[PDB]
């Protein structure tokens, strides 16, 4: 909107009321915290959301960081442009005084004049009339400046990491600015989101632009360069494995490019190869790029870092700080099993709880926005773009790590609960510190992080995908550089030919089986429809469900004990994943 001085009106009972004043300068709206207390400001032809606040000094900025930089030099005539409610604007001159506790004008102005600009002879704002003598309220240091984006990053053989911390305006401003630039430059453009719900949020921010969401139910879909493709990471990788009609995108943008999921890692591998070939430009957006090991990064809004005991199971006494908290809380658990116990403990105390996991995310997450709740109990999945209007994060900093055991018959176990990585701790904490609130957001944690993901099964599974992905030219795709030495797996040792490769893709896509487990079955020469391997494993490969031995009724109508030839912990780690794998073993999908 237009630069100048604005009355801040509040629609109350039987009429609007000037609760304050504000100054829009260089594109951002400045005022005082006690006037709007974080609330959104409505304009005809516009919407204004807060971006920065200093509650202690009573200041708040809309649409960017504080930009008023001029200050008052003692013994200088100032001028308060007083905007009193129901009265015409007035220029009042006076000579201000001195400080006392950690420059105040002796002007008596009605309540509602708070936020009126204080101006020197140069017509620059040197402060805001506020705290009733009334102190010339000014920020010690301005922004927190400008953008995070908009160079000539649209060049072949250039890959850009955008380190965008929450509150950056990534989705609302940065991403649509990128797409507009790509379309001006006539670049065939692909956008990659970690989840459907995030992809849907991109569609909203990108409204008005030629965007097309690409379902994984389809191997390829082509109109032309004028259409921008949008899809989940996993969708892109499955297409790379399923189709030879993958378009040679000129610009590939990956959001939440830290996602350690095998499909996501393989995607960053292929993407990087395309950039290297001189074919494409790529942009990886993440607040924790490779090399970032600070659990406590900066945030656009202050975060209170509190370290104390956190329960891993149901409690009965000693943790009143958990349930006495008035606001909303996001709690990160090491597993769904752990999540269910915590959630039930909280629900027993009358707390409304939403639970989140990988497979329930796209159906449960929309409830956090719409319905009213107290706690979110989530797995590491919410480390990829999940946004919450919460004030607190409870983070025991623990997780389960899938590991391929080589001692004895090869199998995948879930090690832990083990301490999370520094990046993950930063992402978890990063759920808060976004939106200015009266009290600082709280990050309640326990334990230190650990850089021990070198034996993580995901890096090997990514290579099982990668050397089963071809490029039209013949070039071999490897892991993204900074991730390349996170596995000791040999290159092209997981390559599959012919129908083996086809089965491998189908075991993953239609079977919903883990990459490792899919690869083992496929390289064995087993057909997709055949499920006899689910019952012919060794006794020690027996699968348990709630302390009881699983017994499946086959498609034929036979009752056999569930006992896979290859054991992968992730297919029985939770009632839902097991329920799914039993549908597979029965041959119902």
């Amino acid at each position: 909107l237009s630069e100048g001085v604005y009355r801040i009106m509040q629609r109350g009972l039987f009429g609007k009321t000037q609760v304050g004043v504000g100054i829009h300068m260089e594109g951002v709206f400045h005022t005082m915290w006690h006037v709007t207390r974080g609330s959104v400001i409505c304009h005809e032809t516009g919407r204004l959301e807060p971006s920065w606040a200093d509650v202690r000094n009573d200041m708040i900025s809309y649409g960017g960081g504080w930009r008023l930089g001029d200050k008052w030099d003692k013994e200088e005539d100032v001028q308060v442009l007083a905007i009193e409610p129901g009265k015409n604007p007035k220029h009042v001159q006076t000579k201000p005084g001195l400080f006392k506790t950690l420059g105040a004008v002796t002007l008596d102005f009605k309540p509602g004049t708070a936020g009126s600009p204080i101006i020197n002879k140069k017509g620059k704002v040197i402060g805001l009339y506020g705290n009733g003598v009334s102190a010339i309220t000014q920020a010690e240091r301005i922004g927190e400046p400008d953008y995070e984006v908009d160079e000539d990053i649209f060049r072949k053989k250039r890959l850009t990491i955008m380190d965008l911390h929450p509150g950056a305006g990534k989705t609302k401003r940065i991403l649509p600015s990128i797409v507009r630039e790509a379309l001006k430059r006539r670049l065939r453009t692909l956008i990659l989101a970690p989840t459907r719900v995030v992809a849907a949020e991109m569609e909203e921010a990108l409204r008005g632009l030629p965007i097309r969401y690409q379902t994984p139910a389809v191997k390829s879909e082509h109109t032309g360069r004028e259409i921008v493709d949008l899809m989940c990471h996993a969708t892109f990788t499955t297409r790379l494995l399923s189709s030879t009609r993958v378009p040679n995108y000129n610009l590939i943008v990956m959001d939440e490019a830290h996602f350690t999921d095998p499909c996501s890692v393989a995607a960053r591998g292929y993407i990087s190869t395309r950039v290297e070939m001189g074919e494409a430009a790529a942009i990886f957006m993440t607040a924790t790029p490779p090399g970032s090991i600070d659990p406590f990064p900066q945030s656009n809004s202050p975060i209170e870092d509190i370290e104390r005991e956190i329960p891993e199971r149901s409690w009965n006494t000693g943790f009143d700080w958990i349930t006495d908290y008035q606001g909303k809380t996001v709690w990160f658990v090491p597993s769904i099993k752990a999540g269910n116990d915590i959630a039930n403990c909280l629900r027993k105390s009358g707390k409304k709880v939403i639970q989140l996991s990988r497979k329930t995310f796209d159906t449960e997450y929309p409830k956090t926005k719409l319905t009213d709740w107290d706690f979110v109990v989530t797995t590491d999945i919410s480390e990829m773009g999940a946004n919450f209007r919460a004030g607190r994060v409870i983070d025991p900093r623990r997780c389960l790590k899938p590991v391929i055991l080589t001692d004895g018959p090869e199998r995948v176990i879930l090690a832990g609960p083990i301490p999370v990585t520094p990046a993950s701790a930063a992402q978890r904490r990063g759920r808060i510190g976004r939106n200015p609130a009266q009290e600082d957001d709280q990050y309640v944690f326990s334990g230190d992080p650990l850089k021990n993901d070198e034996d993580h099964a995901h890096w090997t599974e990514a290579k099982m995908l990668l050397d089963n992905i071809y490029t039209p030219e013949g070039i071999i795709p490897t892991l993204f550089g900074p991730e390349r030495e996170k596995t000791q797996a040999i290159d092209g040792e997981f390559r599959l030919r012919g129908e083996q490769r086809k089965t491998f893709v189908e075991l993953m896509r239609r079977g919903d089986l883990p990459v490792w487990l899919s690869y083992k079955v496929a390289s064995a020469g087993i057909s997709y429809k055949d499920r006899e391997w689910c019952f012919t494993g060794e006794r020690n490969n027996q699968i348990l469900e709630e302390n009881m031995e699983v017994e499946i009724w086959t498609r034929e109508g036979e009752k056999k004990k569930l006992r896979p030839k290859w054991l992968d912990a992730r297919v029985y780690a939770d009632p839902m994943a097991l329920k799914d794998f039993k549908e597979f073993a029965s041959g119902r999908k």
Binding site: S2, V5, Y6, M9, I23, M25, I41, L48, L81, Q93
Partner: peptide, 15 residues
């Protein structure tokens, strides 16, 4: 969520 803006004046010094 019920705040709005109406413009009053511009940043200037008075003669």
């Amino acid at each position: 969520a019920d705040l709005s803006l109406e413009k009053a004046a511009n940043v200037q010094w008075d003669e």
